[PDB]
Structure formats: structure tokens, C-alpha cells
Write a protein that binds this DNA or RNA. Structure first.
Ligand SMILES: [Mg+2]
Ligand SMILES: [Mg+2]
Ligand SMILES: [Mg+2]
Ligand SMILES: [Mg+2]
Ligand SMILES: [Mg+2]
Ligand SMILES: [Mg+2]
Ligand SMILES: [Mg+2]
Ligand SMILES: [Mg+2]
Ligand SMILES: [Mg+2]
Ligand SMILES: [Mg+2]
Ligand SMILES: [Mg+2]
Ligand SMILES: [Mg+2]
Ligand SMILES: [Mg+2]
Ligand SMILES: [Mg+2]
Ligand SMILES: [Mg+2]
Ligand SMILES: [Mg+2]
Ligand SMILES: [Mg+2]
Ligand SMILES: [Mg+2]
Ligand SMILES: [Mg+2]
Ligand SMILES: [Mg+2]
Ligand SMILES: [Mg+2]
Ligand SMILES: [Mg+2]
Ligand SMILES: [Mg+2]
Ligand SMILES: [Mg+2]
Ligand SMILES: [Mg+2]
Ligand SMILES: [Mg+2]
Ligand SMILES: [Mg+2]
Ligand SMILES: [Mg+2]
Ligand SMILES: [Mg+2]
Ligand SMILES: [Mg+2]
Ligand SMILES: [Mg+2]
Ligand SMILES: [Mg+2]
Ligand SMILES: [Mg+2]
Ligand SMILES: [Mg+2]
Ligand SMILES: [Mg+2]
Ligand SMILES: [Mg+2]
Ligand SMILES: [Mg+2]
Lengths: 90, 58, 59, 42, 95
RNA sequence: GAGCUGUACGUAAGCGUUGAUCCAGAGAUUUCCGAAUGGGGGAACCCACUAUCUUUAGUCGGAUAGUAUCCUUACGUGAAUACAUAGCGUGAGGAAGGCAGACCCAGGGAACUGAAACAUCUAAGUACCUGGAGGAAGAGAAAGAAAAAUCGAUUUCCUGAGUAGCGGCGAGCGAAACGGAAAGAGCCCAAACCAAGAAGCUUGCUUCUUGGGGUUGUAGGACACUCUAUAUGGAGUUACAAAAGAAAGUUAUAAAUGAAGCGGUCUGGAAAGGCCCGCCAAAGACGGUAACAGCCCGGUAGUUGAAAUGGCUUUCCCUCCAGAGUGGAUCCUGAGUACGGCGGAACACGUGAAAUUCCGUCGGAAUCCGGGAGGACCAUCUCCCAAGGCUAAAUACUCCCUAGUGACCGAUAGUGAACCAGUACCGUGAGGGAAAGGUGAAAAGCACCCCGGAAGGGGAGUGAAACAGUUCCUGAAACCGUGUGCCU
RNA sequence: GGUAUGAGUAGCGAAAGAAGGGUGAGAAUCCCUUCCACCGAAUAUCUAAGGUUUCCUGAGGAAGGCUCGUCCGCUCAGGGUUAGUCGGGACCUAAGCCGAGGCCGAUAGGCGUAGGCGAUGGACAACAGGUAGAGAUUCCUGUACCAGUGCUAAUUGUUUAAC
RNA sequence: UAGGAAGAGUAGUACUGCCCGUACCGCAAACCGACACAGGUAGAUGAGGAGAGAAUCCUAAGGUGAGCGAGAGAACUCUCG
């Protein structure tokens, strides 16, 4: 499926700053290749993808009352659509 | 390293001095490499001299 | 659940797709902080599971 | 210069899971640490 | 539990024995019950919480279930509860 | 059958008598690593191939399935080499790894220690390693025990007995049978011989496969005759051949119902306690409830209950099945075996006068007119028939489950671990390895005011108590202070 | 396990600071300015290892910091790492390791052939600007290169056999 | 070369290019030394004057004032003239 591959959008000062530049930041399945992300985003949003950049974030160690543990490892994809392509909303 | 016919092989026991000091040793079987055909086809296998005594292939 | 069994396999398969599209939109709205009724998410997940259970029973 | 000059590779090659599994005595170690209930085998 | 929310119970132990009320809530995991106008506590509520004026709030506090007895509308007295089956589902019965 | 969305001190959004949450049975789903098995790898990662499908204008993508190795066994191909074998390929089956740090059997096998030293000996066939397992294992239907004249497979317990023995005759080691018990159960082959092939061609003789037959000692069988059976009966999956089913009952895995005091009064924060009256009891178990409850709650005795799955017991199905007598012409009755020498070991038994049992090595019988044993050995007598296999129960142990028990512990105890413990922490690693329980009945967890940046206080309030104030029952001693009666 | 004594004692870990201004409940110690001083084949700039979030921003000041603290590599929240071309893999092999069959061996295993794995070496295509709270040969701009792919167009070949 | 072969190259166009790492420290308060520890830590770059020089002294770029201070200016000790 395509909606298994794209988990959720990423809303931050950084992600929101590059929306105008037609770059959409998604949290994607940790197993998903940037090729799978390209074709998933095209299926879901009906856009035309120019490039996908991807980066792995390792889990962040957190403490809560003498119990310590790691947040989830994330895979973040930045999807640049074409000039002619329609925008994604958020 | 074992007789294919019988199962003769190394077994442990004692070497004893006069004065009866004991130390571990083995008794090896008198295994000889020979061509026989247990299976239809011939093959080089360990066989004890004792097993060869009397009737065998060779 | 019994209403799902009234449907054909192909019809159920179409309902799954519809629910997966819905679930994706919920997760998308949740992320952007626009959901409110957050209990819908669990409902839809269960529904999808229910669909796939019925279909596996058919075979 | 102290003992313990760390190397990620040397740590796993000498003490790692697959090295333990590669020998019978290595497997005894894993079995022993499972028996004691260690969080960390290897 | 022998009582449930809606039931008119008599309290048979504690500072409030003799007083009867209606069961506002049941906490069967704690085996406690909340009876209207029984076991009033003064909660010293900071203003931050729902109540933007705050103050000393006089509200009911849970009672242990074994400290109340069900009322039979016919007799109008406390009674032990037995269970009889009409046919479809079982119902509570006074004795 | 009314609440529910787990801890645990939340906020939010929701669900539920059109029966939720919850409990039990049965299904479905079950990422990656791990024997890990498509190849690789520094476990939880990387990289494929072959089909089929899908996507795109096509690369690029996606989905599903298959693809380890070995053994056994079919089949096909197939070298030196002519036949052929090896080899190679394909398809079936099967194995692999783990563990209850227990019990069991086997292979291998210490030392400290004891001997007041130490070498034989002991520790000890122990610890440990390795392999094999099974719910148990091992043993087991006499080539036995004996010699009260008889017993009748094995195992385990009591006894014999610290006896007989063994032993630098030291230290020590130490039986067995009889007797008494638990539990009991007996069987199948190999061989004569018969039939049917199959082959060798010894060319009508011989050895090979399948079936029948047949199982034992003053002998039994084959083989001759004879009587009855050919499912009449009998027996079974625990040996005695092996795979299937059903049905009924019963037990387990959820539950249901279930007697009797709101009794009066006293103290109290609260009554289950005191005093005074009742009552139930096949129910006075246990726990909870504001102090100690048969009658307040969950229950308890008793009596009911199962859609589903599993176990067990019966019955039926199904499956399988010859067993007495009479002779002794001949034939058969486990061979590199028994046994012996040499070297070791096991036997309580240390080579001894050393029987008995096993291993290596070499030598090597008899074979019914036969053979073994009775503690060197011979003779007599007695008892047995080895060199093939199977076999329940009485016995061992407990990672577990259910129900209980304790002149067992009660937080430095009891598990290392009452608490997120094999954690934290230490160590390259194997490995080592803690500390740490208690507010209250209920959060009623201290509104509000005051000093202070806060912390922390003082009031006020809650509460039975706050000198019970979120680590908060009690709160000893060391130790630290303030005050002062007597002294300096 | 707790708590003394030594004791307000030893120590406070190589070094140059100063004043003005600011912030703040509070300042030798935080921020800014100026002067002074120190390193400068380093005490500078990269980068491998190793560490693993320590990075940035906003709050904080119990504990940690040998003093202080408004500050911090500390506490709490949010954030932050972008590649056909850089380094590694979809390439190669060394030492070494594993190793189908195989050889050897009480068990376990040891050795070793084919074949594999294995960089510290071999091969291999991107540069300069810009931008900035936190990445940049990775983002953006410009200009490239490498390996492919389809789609147009001619061209040639289609069994002495282009390639 | 053995082999395999009807498709091959040339030009032009537009499109395609996966996984892992990338933060930050890195002669250091972030690595190895129990410590915000005078120790240890491979490699690239490493300016000027005078100089043979990467020596030396003073500086550049760049970095830094070192997580207790204020006085005092006895013995004594250390490190110096
Ligand atoms: Mg990347
Ligand atoms: Mg270390
Ligand atoms: Mg229901
Ligand atoms: Mg694999
Ligand atoms: Mg002694
Ligand atoms: Mg009752
Ligand atoms: Mg009173
Ligand atoms: Mg009390
Ligand atoms: Mg009590
Ligand atoms: Mg002997
Ligand atoms: Mg002996
Ligand atoms: Mg004899
Ligand atoms: Mg011999
Ligand atoms: Mg004899
Ligand atoms: Mg005798
Ligand atoms: Mg004797
Ligand atoms: Mg015999
Ligand atoms: Mg303890
Ligand atoms: Mg105590
Ligand atoms: Mg306290
Ligand atoms: Mg002093
Ligand atoms: Mg002094
Ligand atoms: Mg001093
Ligand atoms: Mg200092
Ligand atoms: Mg110099
Ligand atoms: Mg910082
Ligand atoms: Mg301080
Ligand atoms: Mg700060
Ligand atoms: Mg090599
Ligand atoms: Mg090689
Ligand atoms: Mg490689
Ligand atoms: Mg940076
Ligand atoms: Mg770009
Ligand atoms: Mg960087
Ligand atoms: Mg240092
Ligand atoms: Mg050096
Ligand atoms: Mg400068």
C-alpha cells in the first residue's frame, strides 16, 4: 500500500518554512526506499515528484522518573514536486 | 576410526607400573584400511584384522 | 460485522481501501492538529481489521 | 596508554553474537547467560 | 456488587448510619459507591482547575459497598438481596 | 449484567442493556533476528536469482511463491573406460536447534582431601566435559538362586550386616542369597522344514528375497501319522501385529444458586469490641468492611451448570488369529561365537588360590552320544540351555499446573530479587552483582492570608491524629544543638 | 548501616587580568564594550577512530560544576543530520577467517579442496558560488560529468552471418 | 579467438539513478585514563621577520585568559635571579 509507506506529515519551523519552495516533509516507513516514497506520494496526492531526499533519525534517549528509554527511530523524506505540479495542502 | 563390520574402536583403561601406579591409556583396535563392498560399490574402509579373519570381500 | 458478511469479497476489498484512505486522512489531520474527534482513528483501524478477518474467513 | 583501546569492529568480532554462536563453547556461554536471565547476551 | 447506580441504599455503618441516599456512582474495582448527601468532604480546590473562582468545595466521597443495604419499595426497609429468574434475564429479589 | 477506555499522580476524545469492559473454549493475524535454511553478515542487517502478476513511454519501482546442507530412497542423466560404476540433476521422505543448573543411560574422567608424611589405596567413577535420550530410564522372563528339598523374570523397600570378605590386612572399602513386603506379565525371532518366485547356471543341484512354519531341557521343534477348530470362540494398538473411527458416561478449562441481626444500648473518628436480647448452621473456611463479624460484603456447606476444546473410562466399530495328542529314522536349536594366553577394567573382592562379567589383541571349541554353572581345578550329583530381540507395574526426579499444609521467614530475615533485579553498577570478556517495603478509613493530599525570587516557614482549613503533610506507622542509640540547678 | 574524631584543618588540578555598561531577588565568576595578556609546526583549520545527541532554540537553577552562578557539556521541553558523483555497500582481492564433498580423530572436534568472506591496499562520474538558530561537494542557483532508459529522425544489417 | 546473433550503433530530445553514514566533540571538559584528571590519542593543512630550519624569539589568520577569590609580603619549603 502507499498509505503504509507515508506515515504522517512533519510540521516544524523548518518543514513549514520550505512549503512555499514546494518541498513537503513526511515521516515515512523506516523500510521505505526514496523510490517507494516517490511513487507513494504520487498515488496519494496526485502530484509529480522531481526529487525525494531521505534521512534516518536514530531514537532519542528520554528519562521519566528513573525509567530511561529511546523514542522511535524515524525516517524523514523531503519530497520536491515540479513547478507545473499542483501543491500539497497541510 | 572404527571397524565398519564390527564396531571395534579405541577404549580407555590403565597402564600400571610395578608399584602399581596407574595412568590412563587406550587400546586401539587393529584396524586396517581395505577395499570391500558392504554397499554394492567397493570402498576403502577401516576393518579390524579380527573381522578380516575368516570370510570377507577384499 | 454481520453487515460485512452480506457484502461480496470485491465489495469488502473496496471498503478497506475507503477506510485506509480515511485512516490516512485522520492521521494527517492529527499531525497538523486539526482532528478533534481523535477516537475515530481507533474505530477505523478496528474496522479495517474486521474487513481483513472476514475476507480471510472466506478462504 | 591504558588497556581498553575501543574498536566497534573488534568488540563484535571477538565478543559478538555471531562469534559466540560459531563455537560450541560460545553457545554454552549464550545458554549460560540466558539461564541467568541476562538482558544482554553478547 | 449487590447495589448499582440508581439504587436507593440505607447506610448501616460510619458517621452517616441511618441516612439513606441514591447511588450516584459505583467503583466496583475499589468496591466503593457514591451515595447522594453521604460522606461529605471539604476539598481545598486551587482556582486553576474547572471552577475559575476555586475555593473549599463540599462534595460527596465514596463509601465502602458493604456499608450500604438496598431498599425494597414495598416494605421501605433495608434487605439482603437474592436473585430469581423470570425467564429472559434474572432480577434482584428482597427477603 | 453495568459500567468501561491496564499501571500510576493526568488531560482529551469516545464506547456501553440493540448488551460494552471483563472471564473461558476455539479460530484468524503473527514484522525482523535466532537451528535460520536463497547468498553474505559485526544477531535483529545487507544483497540476490527463477517463475507469475502488477506499475511506467521505458529504465527505475511493487506483490506473491520457490531457491540451504546432509541422510535415506525412487527416477533420470553419466567420466577416465567397452559394459558399467563414480560423479551430476530432479522428486519424495527424514534430520538439524533448544532445554528442568533435576532424574536416567553411555563415552571420556580430575584434584584438593584422608592415610596425622606419601607412592599402593582414599577422595571417586565423584566434579566436570561429550553423546544419547524418556516421561521415566535402566533391568527383565534363568546356560539364574540354591543344596532346610526346593524356588521359579526384573525392579524397589525392610532385613541379613557394618556380618562374609577386601585392604601398604594400613586409612578405609564392604556384599549377596535366604526371610519379610510393594508390584506383578509375559512374549517375538534365528534354525530345521514347506510353498512361491528370483537368479547362479555348481546346468535340476546350490544361495538370495518374500510368505508360511517354529521357539525349547530327564528337552522342544521340524518331520511322520491322529483329533478338533478355519472366526464357533479368542485377542488387540502398554510388549505379545497395526491403523482407523463413532457413540455414551465422566473429569478439566468460565460460572450459577446459596441460611441467619440495618436487634437494643455503652465507649468511640468509626463497632466487627463491652453489656443485654435474638437467630442460622450439611454454612463457626478464608478474606474484606473506619477497632476483633456465622447472621454487612465477596463468599463458605450443600445443590446446580458447559456452546467449544482437551483428557480419561466403557461399549460398539474396525483389525488380527489355529491348538491338543502320539512317536525319536533322520534333521534343527544363535562361530571367529564360547573359551584360552597376554594386557586392562567391572565385580564389596587391590591378581590373589580368584570363580563370575566386560574391553583390546592373538589363538580358538563342542555343536545333542551336545553345552554351561554350583568362587582355582577334577570327578560325581544338582540346577540350567549362552553367543538374537521386545516387555507394563512397583522406583527416581520437578522447570511447571491445581488445591492445600507448616510449634518455616517477616524487610540486615525470607530467594540475589516483597520495590520494573539478574536491573543499576563493575569488568575487554567469561563473569561478578547490590541498595531500595509502611500518609490516612477515606485524598478529605493543606482554599485563603502572611514573609520569601524560590525553597522553607507561620497562620487558616481537612482529619481521630499533620509532632500522620506525597516517601509521610513506630521512631532506640551514637552524634549535633538551645536552655539552665550545682561545680570549675 | 548510621555518626563522630582529625577540622573549619589539607585541598580547591600548571596560566593575566582590568574597568565601564547591562541583566537579575541576588553578580569577581552570566552578557556586551574597550584596553591588557597568552598560543601561533599551535592552544589554529580539517579529518579518522572513539563517544552517541553532548549539537540548536526556549525555559530552569534542586542536584552536578572542587567557589559563585542569572551561566553550563547539567535539568525540562521542543527541534536539528537531505548525496547517481563524498566514505562504505549493490566492484576487487591481501593477511587472516570460514569451508560442500574430502582427510584425520574416544565423544566433542581438528585440518583442508572447490568455493566464499575479509581493507589497512586496487578500481570508480561535480565543481564554483549562495544561504543559515542547528546540514551542506548533500539544500538552492549556475555550469557539468557518469551509467542507463524510452521517444523522434536519418543510417546500416538481417545467415559467407552488422553487432 | 571459442561461442551467441537481427538488430545494432550515430545524432537529437526528455526522463531514470537504490541502501548505509552525514548532527556535535575530535591534542579534547564530549575519545582511553573512576574526575570538567598537567598523562595517552593515527593522518591532512600548518603564514611573516631574522633563520639552514617545522629550531629560536616576537607576531598573522585564527584561537585563548584555563570554574575559587581578596589581602599579606614572617619562619620554612619549593621554583628562580
Ligand atoms: Mg543519504
Ligand atoms: Mg571501560
Ligand atoms: Mg455479550
Ligand atoms: Mg538467510
Ligand atoms: Mg595429615
Ligand atoms: Mg449471605
Ligand atoms: Mg458515641
Ligand atoms: Mg486502628
Ligand atoms: Mg482490621
Ligand atoms: Mg583379564
Ligand atoms: Mg576393585
Ligand atoms: Mg568354572
Ligand atoms: Mg581375550
Ligand atoms: Mg566359565
Ligand atoms: Mg564348588
Ligand atoms: Mg567366596
Ligand atoms: Mg540352547
Ligand atoms: Mg533481602
Ligand atoms: Mg523495620
Ligand atoms: Mg521524610
Ligand atoms: Mg592541625
Ligand atoms: Mg595550616
Ligand atoms: Mg591553604
Ligand atoms: Mg583551576
Ligand atoms: Mg616550535
Ligand atoms: Mg550547547
Ligand atoms: Mg555550587
Ligand atoms: Mg541557562
Ligand atoms: Mg588468502
Ligand atoms: Mg581461495
Ligand atoms: Mg566484500
Ligand atoms: Mg555546524
Ligand atoms: Mg540540488
Ligand atoms: Mg559536520
Ligand atoms: Mg586532559
Ligand atoms: Mg604519538
Ligand atoms: Mg588576531
Amino acid at each position: 500500500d502507499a498509505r503504509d509507506i507515508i506515515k504522517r506529515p512533519v510540521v516544524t519551523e523548518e518543514s513549514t518554512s520550505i512549503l512555499d519552495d514546494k518541498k513537503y516533509t513526511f515521516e515515512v516507513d523506516t523500510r521505505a526506499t526514496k523510490t517507494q516514497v516517490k511513487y507513494a506520494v504520487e498515488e496519494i496526492f496526485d502530484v509529480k515528484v522531481a526529487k525525494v531526499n531521505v534521512m534516518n533519525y536514530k531514537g532519542k534517549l528520554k528519562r521519566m522518573g528513573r525509567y530511561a528509554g529511546y523514542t522511535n527511530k524515524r525516517r524523514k523524506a523531503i519530497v520536491t514536486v515540479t513547478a507545473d505540479s499542483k501543491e500539497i495542502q497541510f | 576410526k572404527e571397524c565398519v563390520i564390527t564396531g571395534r574402536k579405541s577404549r580407555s583403561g590403565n597402564k600400571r607400573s610395578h608399584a602399581m601406579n596407574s595412568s590412563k591409556r587406550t587400546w586401539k583396535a587393529n584396524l586396517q584400511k581395505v577395499r570391500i563392498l558392504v554397499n554394492g560399490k567397493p570402498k576403502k574402509v577401516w576393518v579390524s584384522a579380527r573381522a578380516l579373519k575368516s570370510g570377507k570381500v577384499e | 460485522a454481520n453487515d460485512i458478511r452480506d457484502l461480496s469479497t470485491t465489495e469488502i476489498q473496496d471498503q478497506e481501501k475507503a477506510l485506509k484512505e480515511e485512516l490516512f486522512n485522520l492521521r494527517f489531520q492529527l499531525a497538523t492538529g486539526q482532528l478533534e474527534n481523535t477516537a475515530r482513528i481507533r474505530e477505523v483501524r478496528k474496522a479495517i481489521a474486521r474487513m481483513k478477518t472476514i475476507v480471510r474467513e472466506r478462504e | 596508554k591504558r588497556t581498553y583501546q575501543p574498536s566497534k569492529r573488534k568488540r563484535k568480532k571477538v565478543h559478538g553474537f555471531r562469534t559466540r554462536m560459531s563455537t560450541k563453547n560460545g553457545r554454552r556461554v549464550l545458554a549460560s547467560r540466558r539461564r541467568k536471565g541476562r538482558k544482554v547476551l553478547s | 456488587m449487590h447495589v448499582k447506580k440508581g439504587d436507593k441504599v440505607k447506610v448501616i455503618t460510619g458517621k452517616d448510619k441511618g441516612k439513606s441516599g441514591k447511588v450516584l456512582a459505583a467503583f466496583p474495582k475499589k468496591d466503593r459507591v457514591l451515595i447522594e448527601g453521604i460522606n461529605m468532604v471539604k476539598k481545598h480546590t486551587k482556582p486553576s482547575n474547572v471552577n475559575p473562582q476555586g475555593g473549599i468545595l463540599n462534595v460527596e466521597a465514596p463509601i465502602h459497598v458493604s456499608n450500604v443495604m438496598l431498599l425494597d419499595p414495598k416494605t421501605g426497609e433495608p434487605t439482603r438481596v437474592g436473585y430469581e429468574v423470570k425467564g429472559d434475564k434474572k432480577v434482584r429479589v428482597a427477603k
